[PDB]
Amino acid sequence: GMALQEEFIDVNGTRVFQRKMVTDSNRRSIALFHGYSFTSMDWDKADLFNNYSKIGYNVYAPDYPGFGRSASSEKYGIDRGDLKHAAEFIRDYLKANGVARSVIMGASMGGGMVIMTTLQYPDIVDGIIAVAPAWVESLKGDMKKIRQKTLLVWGSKDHVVPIALSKEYASIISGSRLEIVEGSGHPVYIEKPEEFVRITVDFLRNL
């Protein structure tokens, strides 16, 4: 039956904690990348493993190296602000799990990471969900090139990553779906979990 597996995986020498809900029959994958302040445990609040599994996605969620339960990492660490390290991580992490292509979702820091991964390795990305992505303001000229279906999610009360950037990023990424969730600040999947699920499930169904 369906099980939430919690385990440690080696990603090129870095001991990564992950949570996953998968079955060998699914032909769809989604991987979830947390913000600076949260971990893979925090996706419990919106029950994302069960909700995405029920629409036929294999679901993977690691703690980024240096965060949560994962080891620090010279190769992947983001201490020095190298977002290309995070694109390497996401590519390598999917490969370690035997996943050739996936939808990738990121919140905040993680949203920056999934954007960068799509800019570097577009052939591995089936779609993007980015929840108020941080650290990408310098990447607009490359973001204009993204061809993947993209969902941008922002809380109406977000003052961490300005809501003005929401409308700008929605213009830059052609075909992007922008949804502003009433009554939420920056971590939408914690503060308005039901609406987060409704919107993200609808996007994924129609990908």
UniProtKB/TrEMBL annotation:
Record Pfam families: Abhydrolase_1 (PF00561)
Localization per record: Cytoplasm
Keyword Cytoplasm set for record: yes
GO cellular component: cytoplasm
UniProt keyword annotations, A-Z: Cytoplasm
Domain (AB hydrolase-1) ranges: 32-140, 145-193
Gene3D superfamilies, per the entry: alpha/beta hydrolase (3.40.50.1820)
Annotated family: Belongs to the AB hydrolase superfamily. ABHD14 family.
Protein name in the entry: AB hydrolase-1 domain-containing protein
